[PDB]
Paper text:
Recently our laboratory has introduced a powerful mode of photochemistry into proteins, namely triplet energy transfer (EnT) photocatalysis, by developing an enantioselective [2 + 2] cyclase that relies on a genetically programmed benzophenone as a triplet sensitizer. Compared with benzophenones, thioxanthones have strong absorbance features that extend into the visible spectrum and are less susceptible to off-pathway processes that compromise EnT efficiency.
After screening ∼3,200 clones, an optimized SpEnT1.3 variant was identified containing six mutations clustered around the active site (P23C, Y37A, Y121G, G226L S271C, H287L) that achieves a sixfold improvement in reaction yield (78% with SpEnT1.3 versus 13% with SpEnT1.0). Notably, improvements in photoenzyme efficiency and stereocontrol across evolution also coincided with a substantial reduction in side-product formation, with only ∼5% of 3 and 4 formed with SpEnT1.3. Despite promoting more challenging chemistry, detailed characterization of SpEnT1.3 reveals that this photoenzyme exhibits impressive kinetic properties that are in line with the thioxanthone-containing [2 + 2] cyclase VEnT1.3, with a kcat of 8.7 ± 0.64 s−1 (at 100% light intensity), a Km of <15 µM and a total turnover number of >300 under aerobic conditions. Molecular docking of (S,S)-2a reveals a productive binding pose with the ligand occupying a tight binding pocket lined by Cys23, Pro36, Ile72, Met90, Gln195, Leu226, Cys271 and Leu287. Mutation of Gln195 to Ala leads to a fourfold decrease in activity, confirming its importance to SpEnT1.3 photocatalysis.
Author numbering: 1 to 314
Write the structure that this text describes.
């Protein structure tokens, strides 16, 4: 059982973005990168940037900061009803960021009164609930910590009613995250990457912030220390998963298990992925060259929540 590999042509899009992680298309087809970077001394110096795709030129729209504590934004999703970005920050929690660069911190505490943990990945379901991974410890002003060895990583659901609910915990560095939907649009499965354990986990989604039947859903190949990072579904509900401790993007079928195909990259350390809406084009961030690339996949992406806005014919 050798896993078949393809080597499509990758094209460089932009470069020199230290930590280039989360990326997203907004409702105008503009492209954003979050850059969870620090300065030499270690002070957070996170950034959210917009990329001109015909030129690769970059524009910093936001340097998140709260009480002089800098952000480490890592993951991002675009909203549906308003063109605004929900941003998962490893120092600041969940931010909502306008295209005009202004932002709001969403929650200092969760629904049980606990201080919020720093967040990394997030995925809207089609009902507008945001599922979030939190591999960091408490948000600032607490000292930064990371569940790369100890199991204090957590999962949240930020519901359409405005509740920040912790739905599971005791993960070792949860990273990427995605929601599988049935053909009729109902959220069905939550998939969570547990980065250093090489596991992808699945839950049955029974409602807003109600998940159960947790199980190991997929295995990430590779012998290195870090496995899965970012992930996204294609329109057939194949899950593409950046394998950080490698030069590959893994492709799982709807049934999980072992990858049914691997995509070899011209670089190590793939981090985040995102389809361009209505195209087969996948954008990939990677931390060997701190750069962004694109390549063509075999079919279009699964529509993100922000693509599901509909309007009465009147
Ligand atoms: Mg649990
Ligand atoms: Mg993505």
């Amino acid at each position: 059982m050798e896993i078949p590999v393809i080597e499509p042509l990758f094209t460089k899009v932009t470069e020199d973005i230290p930590g280039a992680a989360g990326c997203v298309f907004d409702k105008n087809g503009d492209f954003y990168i979050v850059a969870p970077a620090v300065e030499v001394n270690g002070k957070p110096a996170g950034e959210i940037l917009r990329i001109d795709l015909k030129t690769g030129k970059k524009t910093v729209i936001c340097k998140p900061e709260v009480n002089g504590y800098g952000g480490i934004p890592a993951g991002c999703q675009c909203d549906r009803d308003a063109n605004q970005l929900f941003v998962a920050d490893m120092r600041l929690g969940l931010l909502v960021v306008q295209t005009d660069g202004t932002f709001e911190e969403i929650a200092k505490k969760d629904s049980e009164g606990r201080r919020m943990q720093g967040c990394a990945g997030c995925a809207f379901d089609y009902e507008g609930n945001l599922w979030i991974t939190a591999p960091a410890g408490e948000v600032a002003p607490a000292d930064f910590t990371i569940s790369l060895q100890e199991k204090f990583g957590s999962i949240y659901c930020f519901t359409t009613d405005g509740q920040m609910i912790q739905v599971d915990t005791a993960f070792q560095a949860p990273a990427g995250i995605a929601v599988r939907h049935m053909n009729d649009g109902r959220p069905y499965q939550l998939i969570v990457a547990e980065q250093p354990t090489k596991k992808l986990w699945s839950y049955d989604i029974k409602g807003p912030a109600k998940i159960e039947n947790k199980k190991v859903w997929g295995h990430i190949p590779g012998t290195h220390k870090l496995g899965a990072a970012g992930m996204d579904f294609d329109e057939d509900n194949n899950l593409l998963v950046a394998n950080f401790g490698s030069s590959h993007i893994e492709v799982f079928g709807p049934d999980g298990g072992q990858p049914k195909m691997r995509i070899r990259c011209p670089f190590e350390k793939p981090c985040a992925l995102h389809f361009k809406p209505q195209t087969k084009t996948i954008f990939v961030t990677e931390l060997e060259n701190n750069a962004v690339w694109k390549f063509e996949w075999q079919r279009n992406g699964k529509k993100q929540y922000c693509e599901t806005l509909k309007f009465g014919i009147f």
